[PDB]
Amino acid sequence: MSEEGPQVKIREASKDNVDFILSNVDLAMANSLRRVMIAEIPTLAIDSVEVETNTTVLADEFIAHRLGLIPLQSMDIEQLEYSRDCFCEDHCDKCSVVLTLQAFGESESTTNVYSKDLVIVSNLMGRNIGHPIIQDKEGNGVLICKLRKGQELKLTCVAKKGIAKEHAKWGPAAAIEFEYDPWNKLKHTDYWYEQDSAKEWPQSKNCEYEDPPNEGDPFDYKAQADTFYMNVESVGSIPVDQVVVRGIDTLQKKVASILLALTQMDQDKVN
Template sequence: MAPSRAGPTAEELDQRKIVGINPETVTDTTNTDFPGHYPGEDHSWDLERFRNGFQIEFHHNDPFDASFSLIGVDASIANAFRRILIADIPTLAIESVFITDNTSVIQDEVLAHRLGLIPFKGNQDGLKNFLRFWKKPEPGVEPTLYDFNTVMLSLNVECTHNPKASEDEEDPTKLYNHAHVYAKDIQFHPVGRQKKYFSGEGAIAPVHPDILIAKMRPGQAIELTMHMHKGVGSDHAKFSPVATASYRLMPTITITQPILGKDAEKFAKCFPKGVIGLEKVSRKEAAQKGSGYEGHEGELKAVVKDPMRDTVSRECLRHAEFQGKVRLGRRRDHFIFSIESTGQWNSDDLFLESVVKLKEKCAKLEKQVINMAR
């Protein structure tokens, strides 16, 4: 048993959360063998302690883009959310393409690949609760297609001359009909109960109707049908619900000695706009002994305004006048998440769904551990 010792000071507790950023090195990059546990200290799990230290703060929340801070968890938990967002949340995508006619310059397999990567949207209740996963049959076995596991689409376009175009027209989109084939040309054909879930504004359609699929000229045509199925990103990237799902550690900037006047202006330029602010030294600060501001009332001083904007470029550490006056770092338990949805899910719903998926994985693991212990 490890010897007990006096509890850590507040300064020690704060320093444990910081990854040091130096001019040429990065320090304290690894956590303890068991994250959050230190020899001689009692760090047994306590729900109330975790609840008091855990926070989620949203910075902006748009349907296609969300940014929020996940505070008070280990990197393994944050990374689990990131991996689930990329690989384990189901979406709908084109899986099978049956080409009847393709006389465009794009090869069949390239055309099918382009179609598969187009993100689609539809009624959320139908996508989440009505549609189920489709199982690929064994070789030689006819696939079983139902309204709850397969969505039918078609693309039937032919390029022709536009009789209304002027003789000197050079724009192919005006000179020809269907010179450009877009995602909006894809037609959805509801089958069975799909009419109940996917109709009106909730019909299945491309998220971005102006995605260019092909360019054609008179005499060329594309005629095909498509089957859409539910899948997850671990099977293929086209099923991933996010364009990006990433996180970074919260930067920390600590000014240890006053930075004044021209140096303060230069210091602010070492960081992205909005990270460092310039304020005037107050009379109270100038009168306080040992503050470093004595006799500098009214002069500009550098203050940390918004460290979240910082990119940790270390530019300030390259200037001699700032040596010993600033300390850079990153908080190891503060993760700034960025989620960009492809459109089938709202960005904030994606994170909530990742929490549900992680809970399911934990329940499965718990069951397996119990079975192993028997």
């Protein structure tokens, strides 16, 4: 086992949540890891809509914005290309996905337009991608709109590849909890009290994983932050372990890009 490197202890896992401890690591590294896990992991989402028939009570960009946030399966996103790089005109077969939506309110009672009715008509080339993410029991997923008697909606959707640094729709992580030093041994926070600070502030669940300090011990002025407690939840598109692994990979690639540029510049200086 790699005893010279960062250590990890998973305590809990599921389809959505991973709950773990990260030890023997700096604070800067853990912070950068969480920043990348939230902001810089690609995913597949709807990026353009064109509408044929709209006899609803809502607007057009309203429904466009509603569609732009629906989650879709993006496990194999490494085999697509940024549409600004593909040589195709407009959208490719290798640099986009295409879906169609059609609905009509034939019945007297109002009819809901969910996200289970998005149908893919492009060619996937045997890649696991484009499927809508469904997490409810009934399987309907995100409800999109509402229809009455004699109302129809027809439109076509183009979904592309990007990151969360340009829109919140491509983000695969909902919210990640990041804690450390629940006993305030390092004196990083200073408490606010009325009578007794030790009682007004509740205790974190994490206190059980460290030993309380003793009043006879002088302030330890040599310690550093080393143990962090994280919890990560996914929107649903990517598996959560893949979220963590891809965050690490993206950080590695960024540092490697820095290294390559530095080597190139050193070769230039040689000239």
